[PDB]
Every structure is written in C-alpha cells, then in structure tokens.
Structure 1
Amino acid sequence: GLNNLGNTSYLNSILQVLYFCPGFKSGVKHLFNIISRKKYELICSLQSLIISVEQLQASFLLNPLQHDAQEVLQCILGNIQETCQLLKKGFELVEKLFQGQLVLRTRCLECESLTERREDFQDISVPVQEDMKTLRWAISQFASVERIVGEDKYFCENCHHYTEAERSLLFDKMPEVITIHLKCFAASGLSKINTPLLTPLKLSLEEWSTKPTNDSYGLFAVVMHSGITISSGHYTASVKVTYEGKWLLFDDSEVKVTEEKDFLNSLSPSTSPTSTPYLLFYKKL
C-alpha cells in the first residue's frame, strides 16, 4: 500500500534528513504552538507529518515529475524562513540551523589591494572531480586561493583596469548544520559523475575560517542518488541516530539498520557504489 512513496523520493529524503537534524523538530513544534493560538499551512502540515513519523517510529521500536533533492530542501527551508519573519511582524530556526556567513576576499595582483564581500550561505557547493579525491580537496577547490586570469580577469577600481586577481573564501559565522552540496555532474552534453569523494566522518573547517576555532563537525546524514543520468533516478537517505550510533537506510518503503563501519565502507569510491552521494550533512559537536 506504500508503493507510492517512491514517486516523491526527493521529498522523502529531505524529510528523513530534517527529521533527525538536532533541534529541527524541536523548533518546528515551537512554531506550531505559536501559529496554533494565533488563529501557515506548511508548518501545520510539517507538524502532522512529524507526529505521524513519531507514531511509526514508536511502533517500530516497540513492535517490530522527478525533482532535485537539494532544490526541495531549499524551498522548504525558504518557506519556513518567510513564516518566521512574518511571525516577527524562537523565530530563527533556519538562521541558527542552516544559515552561515561567508567572507569573499579578492586581491588584485597589480596593486595588491584587498576587497571583501559578505554573503550568507545555507550549503557549501563543492566539485567532485578536477577539470582518489577527498572532501578536503573539494572544499579547497571551494575556499582556497584561486587565481582568475585570462578571459576571467578582475576589474580593479583602484587601477581602473582589468587585472589578474586571487579569490579566497573564508567561513566567518558557522551554523549548527553544515550542508555539503556535491556537484556530482559535469558538462562538455550534461553527464553524471559516478565517482564519489572520500567522505570523512569528522570535518574541521578551521583551514578556511576567519578565526582559529576548535569546533569540529560530525557526519550524520547522507542523501544519495542512484542512476546513470542527471535527468532521472532515485533518491535514498542514510541518517544517523543520536540504535544510537547506527545508520538508518531509508529506501522507499523499507528501513535498514547498519553499523557505522559498514556504512562507511559502502561510501568508499573504490567499491564504485551505485548510489552517488549528493548531500552531506554535518552537525557541530
């Protein structure tokens, strides 16, 4: 009777991850109560689904088109944010959980003058192949110093000229949840890169931080995509319970529990997994 779950596996994977995000359902019920006595449907529908899963999870413990997954998560978090800002006119669930701040630094190679931009971010989009690699290499391709030359020269306002420049990104403010959007797709013509990175269970972002910080991050949810093309496929999610310490493999209508070591080996690019990781979620320790 639950063969229709697979038709919305993009939304199911996002909801499965959001369910186990520390404090997400704690914050949603707080907003639901506020909207309850105010008398918006997205918060109410979210609470009903969270209650429904709680009934299902308790029973499990006691009596044993096609859409992008990241895009759906973007719409859900964006709509939650707008409702929170409307409640202003607590209410910072999206800002505290998923929203951080980047400092983008440009250095002209002629005058050596520094210019900076401040931009918010909810996820970190990193490449998976250059054009065996690890996640640190991907963030280095994202945040380390890159030189823009040739057809991509920087226009310096100090020199009033097109000059070569160095661009570097730094993490100023860190959210509780770090989302890694993996560009497991390339262009010539669009194709899917089936070779994943070496995903680590521990992530330290001090290498690209404005200040030296001892805050480490631990992986707790992976959203994978199965298919040989980017136009269609299937989404699965593997979350971590914090049964605690085991990974839940949500596959349409079935749930599988595995050890942390077993799941890590399944993520190895050497074995050539069929499920290509697409979103990595890290929580602050």
Structure 2
Amino acid sequence: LVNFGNTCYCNSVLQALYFCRPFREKVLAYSLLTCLADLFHSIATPPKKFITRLAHEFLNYLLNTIADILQEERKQEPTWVHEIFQGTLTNETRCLTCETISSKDEDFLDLSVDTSITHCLRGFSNTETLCSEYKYYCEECRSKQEAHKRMKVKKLPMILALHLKVFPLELRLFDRMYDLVAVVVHCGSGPNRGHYIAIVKSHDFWLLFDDDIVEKIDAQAIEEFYNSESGYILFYQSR
C-alpha cells in the first residue's frame, strides 16, 4: 500500500503539467508513463480524479520516474523529459578555516529554494552553515571545519519547475526571459482556501482548477489573493 500524497496536490501538479505545452506534446506523442499518456489523451480528446488514473514529493517523483522509464527504453533501443526540465546547479562550499572554495555541479529536473525569486536565481541561494555536530570535512585542512554552503544555477532549463518551501509573471535572467505558465499553491484564504489549487496560463488568459471546476480568473487576481504542506510550485517557460 503506497501513498502518493495529498490528492489535491497531486491533481494540481498533473494539471499544471498539462499546461506545460512541450511536456504535453511529448507525452501525447508517447508503466507510470503509459497511464500518464492515457490520462492526457482523455483531457485532449474530471480533474479531481486525475491522480486516480495512476509520500515522496509527487512532482519530483513523477519526473524522475519518467526519466528512468525513458532512460531504460532508450537503453534497449537527452531523453525528452531532460530536454524540457533538466537544468544544472552548482554547490559551492567554502571552508571557513582555509577559505578554500570547492565546487560541485548537479543535474536537476526541479529546483528547491527556501531577497526575491529574481534575486535568488540570478545570484546565490540556499545559504547554509555547516557547524557543530555537522562540520564539513575539508580536504585542504584534512579535518572537520565550519563551512559556508551556497547554490548557484549554472544551466537554466527549458521549463523551470521551481519549489518554494510574491511571484512575478515574468522572469528576467540576463540572456533569458521566462514567463510564468502554471502555479500549484495552497491558498490561505480567497475563494479557494483549504487545499492545493492549480492556476494555469492558457493562450492569453488564466485558468483556475478547483476540485472539478475550471474557471477563468483575471491576471493579478493571482498575486492579489495567492500556508502550505509542500510549499508551492512555480512553472516558468522560457521565451
């Protein structure tokens, strides 16, 4: 018996993903993936029952499972999940004793951050001090020392799936502009409070999926009305 998590959360992720057009096109043109395929076919040919057609954080679980599916049936025969979602981050670690900086790159399908969104992604993020019982083993000092850890984005993905655990409609990363296309959020108030919701960009207006009802809402009803279990999710598509 396995728990995918909060129902509304998972449905909101699925809905947000449908309005990531390149992800939509490639699944439509395609396990857990076959079910995802059939579900999206239905939508393109009831929202509250999306997840049923199919707890670790669901989105990351979903993308990685597709990544593994596509990496494997590639092996028998840059998977498309990677070319849409994959970015690269760099983790800097600075020993505070020798002040040597070491760098480690990491691939990601989605990105977590704990200032502003724009200031985060353009500069450094997730600053963390390693100390006390969890010091850093420094290879220069050959011993445990205090360290400062921080994250910078090295390669921006086609679609940036950003976990925040005040959001701008457009993102300027100068060299790349990003447009908000989907939001997964647990509202504190407004007429959708109580559970996770998906707010999506469709053509040139915004839709809001609440349980079983899709409804248009005015731009900047968004930041005019929108406390969470798994934070909230921002999907940015580059222009």
Q: TM-score range by the shorter chain?
A: 0.7 to 0.9
Alignment of 1:162-173 (within 5 A): 162-173=144-155
Aligned to 2:51: none
Q: State the percentage of identical aligned residues.
A: 37
Aligned to 1:8: 7
Aligned to 2:83: 96
Distance apart, 1:144 and its partner CA: 6.5
Aligned to 2:36: 46
- Contact 1:126–1:141 at 8 Å: present in 2 too? no
Instruction: Quote the Cα distance in structure 1 between the aligned partners of 2:94 and 2:228.
Output: 42
Aligned counterpart for 2:208 among listed residues 249, 254, 260: 249
Distance apart, 1:240 and its partner CA: 0.5
May I ask how many residue pairs the two structures share in their alignment? 220
SS at the partner of 2:221?
Answer: helix
Distance apart, 1:249 and its partner CA: 0.4
Aligned counterpart for 1:81 among listed residues 67, 85, 89: 67
Distance apart, 1:9 and its partner CA: 2.1
Distance 1:256 1:106, change over 3 A: same
Distance 1:125 1:45, change over 3 A: same
Distance apart, 1:172 and its partner CA: 1.5
- Contact 2:113–2:126 at 8 Å: present in 1 too? no
Distance 1:44 1:110, change over 3 A: closer
What do the CA deviations read for 1:197-222 (whole angstroms, capped 9, x no partner)? Answer: x11112245xxxxxxx5112121111
Aligned counterpart for 1:161 among listed residues 126, 143, 153: 143
Distance apart, 1:51 and its partner CA: 2.0
Distance apart, 1:23 and its partner CA: 0.7
TM-score by length of structure 2 reads: 0.78
Distance apart, 1:104 and its partner CA: 1.1
Distance apart, 1:114 and its partner CA: 2.4
Aligned to 1:180: 162
Aligned to 1:37: none
Aligned to 1:199: 167
- Contact 2:124–2:152 at 8 Å: present in 1 too? no
Q: Are residue 236 (structure 1) and residue 197 (structure 2) matched?
A: yes
- Contact 2:161–2:236 at 8 Å: present in 1 too? yes
SS at the partner of 2:157?
Answer: coil
Distance apart, 1:142 and its partner CA: 6.4
Instruction: Quote the Cα distance in structure 1 between the aligned partners of 2:58 and 2:169.
Output: 25
- Contact 2:182–2:199 at 8 Å: present in 1 too? yes
- Contact 2:123–2:152 at 8 Å: present in 1 too? no
Instruction: Quote the Cα distance in structure 1 between the aligned partners of 2:229 and 2:223.
Output: 13
Which amino acid is 1:153 matched to? K
Distance 1:145 1:16, change over 3 A: closer
For structure 1, which runs of at least 5 residues remain unmatched after alignment?
Answer: 1-6, 33-40, 57-67, 128-132, 184-197, 206-212, 268-272
Distance apart, 1:124 and its partner CA: 2.1
Aligned counterpart for 1:278 among listed residues 207, 229, 232: 232
Instruction: Quote the Cα distance in structure 2 between the aligned partners of 1:260 and 1:148.
Output: 42
SS at the partner of 2:21?
Answer: coil
Aligned to 2:176: 215
Aligned to 2:50: none
Distance 1:223 1:22, change over 3 A: same
What do the CA deviations read for 1:107-165 (whole angstroms, capped 9, x no partner)? Answer: 223323222212122222222xxxxx643466689626655455543222211233333
TM-score by length of structure 1 reads: 0.66
- Contact 1:219–1:280 at 8 Å: present in 2 too? yes
- Contact 1:100–1:173 at 8 Å: present in 2 too? yes
- Contact 1:109–1:164 at 8 Å: present in 2 too? yes
Distance apart, 1:168 and its partner CA: 2.5
Structure ID, larger Rg: 1
Aligned to 1:262: 221
Q: What's the Cα RMSD here?
A: 3.1
Aligned to 2:100: 113
